[PDB]
Design a protein around this ligand. Structure first.
Ligand SMILES: [Zn+2]
Length: 423
């Protein structure tokens, strides 16, 4: 989704333009610093206007109900034209999106088919992997439209604008949520085996998938409500437009929705969960006395010659079960194995690679949030900033073709199911 503006307003008109000199108008993109109206005149030129004022609101009202030569430079301003931004987009991104659309679609249909036909959807983990691949496809469906939009202009109309925007973000938000669920799932399997026996069930997975999609809709509602297509001086766009009375509210809101859900939240999860997972994996192991039933606790004998900081492999062979009196020989490793712990390393790869490709975007959004602070709220800065945003978005969009390549890089069962058709 590009709200990349064709032009933005960093000033307005000083005095009311004569109504009859105005041909047409457009409302500027919410990607812009400031709420704005650009008026097109009965000369080719165009100028900036404040949507607050009754004259502007009345002019627009009249122009919507509808559908002499002056030098108005004395009191009006030309908008910031985003020539460089759009020219770079149209040149480079079409062949990339081609590329990732091809690899991505094939990739993610294969994963889906395999998860349903070979790995058979046995547990919640399989369910989330499946919903991840479906989120990735929903994002892919939209890519051919975006590439065209970049090369040319929006020509799919308003409904398509609203539904494609919907599918993009639903795909985005749900993709994030399922990577998070996959991480949390593996954390419970490894650490809190307590609750993991209820949580790992297929029914549990489906109930939490259904809720998750629904929340991904709620998350996406404002994006759909405020988005529409619009004629901007005989070029059509697909972008969002916020009410000028709540403009900053919405801008801040929607941007931080994305930073918080996309960067902050999953970073907390990842750190926490992989700190957790490492501690459990590195923990000293307990043992049980075969005849006795007594459990040796390697963190806990204050009565025997036993160092609380050491496990069973350091205790001399002379050691005898305190409860019953048999020697060390009669101890086994207390039957504890992480069979439940099926796919930890894969999820950690997927989680890391997600950051690799999407962090530059979330960072550039924070730069855009604090545009005002860095004095980036001017024409020349915003063109560099918008250009960074198109680049980092491009990177980000690439990631939807990568998941299914990881399933071969660090997976195993996804490789072996291909030897089926050679032998
Ligand atoms: Zn014993």
């Amino acid at each position: 989704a590009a709200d990349t503006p064709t032009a933005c307003c960093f000033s307005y008109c000083s005095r009311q333009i004569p109504q009859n000199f105005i041909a047409d108008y457009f409302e500027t993109s919410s990607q812009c610093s400031k709420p704005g109206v650009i008026f097109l005149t009965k000369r080719s030129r165009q100028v900036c206007a404040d949507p607050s004022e009754e004259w502007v609101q009345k002019y627009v009202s009249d122009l919507e109900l509808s559908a002499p030569i002056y030098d108005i430079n004395y009191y009006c301003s030309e908008p910031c034209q985003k020539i460089n931004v759009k020219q770079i987009a149209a040149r480079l991104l079409p062949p990339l999106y081609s590329l990732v659309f091809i690899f991505g679609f094939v990739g993610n249909m294969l994963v889906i088919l395999i998860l349903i036909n070979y790995k058979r959807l046995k547990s919640a983990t399989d369910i989330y992997l499946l919903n991840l691949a479906i989120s990735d496809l929903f994002f892919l469906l939209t890519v051919p439209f975006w590439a065209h939009y970049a090369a040319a202009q929006w020509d799919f109309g308003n409904t398509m604008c609203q539904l494609l925007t919907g599918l993009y973000f639903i795909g985005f938000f749900s993709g994030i949520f399922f990577i998070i669920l996959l991480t949390i799932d593996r954390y419970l399997a490894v650490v809190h085996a307590v609750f993991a026996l209820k949580a790992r069930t297929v029914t549990f997975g489906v109930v939490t998938s259904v809720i998750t999609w629904v929340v991904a809709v709620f998350a996406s509602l404002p994006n759909i409500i405020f988005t529409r297509s619009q004629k901007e001086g005989l070029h059509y766009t697909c972008s969002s437009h916020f009410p000028y009375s709540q403009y900053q509210f919405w801008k801040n809101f929607q941007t931080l929705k994305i930073v918080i859900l996309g960067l902050v939240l999953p970073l907390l999860v990842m750190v926490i969960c992989y700190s957790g997972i490492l501690k459990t994996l590195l923990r000293m192991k307990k043992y049980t006395c075969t005849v006795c039933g007594y459990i040796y606790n390697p963190e806990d004998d204050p009565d025997n010659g036993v160092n609380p900081g050491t496990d069973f492999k350091d205790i001399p062979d002379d050691w005898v079960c305190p409860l019953c009196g048999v020697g060390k020989d009669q101890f086994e490793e207390v039957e504890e194995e992480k069979k439940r712990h099926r796919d930890v390393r894969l999820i950690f790869t997927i989680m890391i690679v997600y950051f690799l490709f999407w962090a530059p975007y979330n960072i550039v959004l924070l730069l855009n949030t604090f545009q005002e602070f860095f004095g980036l709220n001017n024409c020349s800065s915003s063109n560099a900033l918008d250009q960074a945003m198109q680049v980092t978005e491009a990177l980000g969009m690439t990631h939807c073709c990568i998941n299914p390549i990881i399933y071969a890089f660090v997976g195993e069962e996804f490789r072996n199911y291909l030897l089926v058709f050679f032998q």
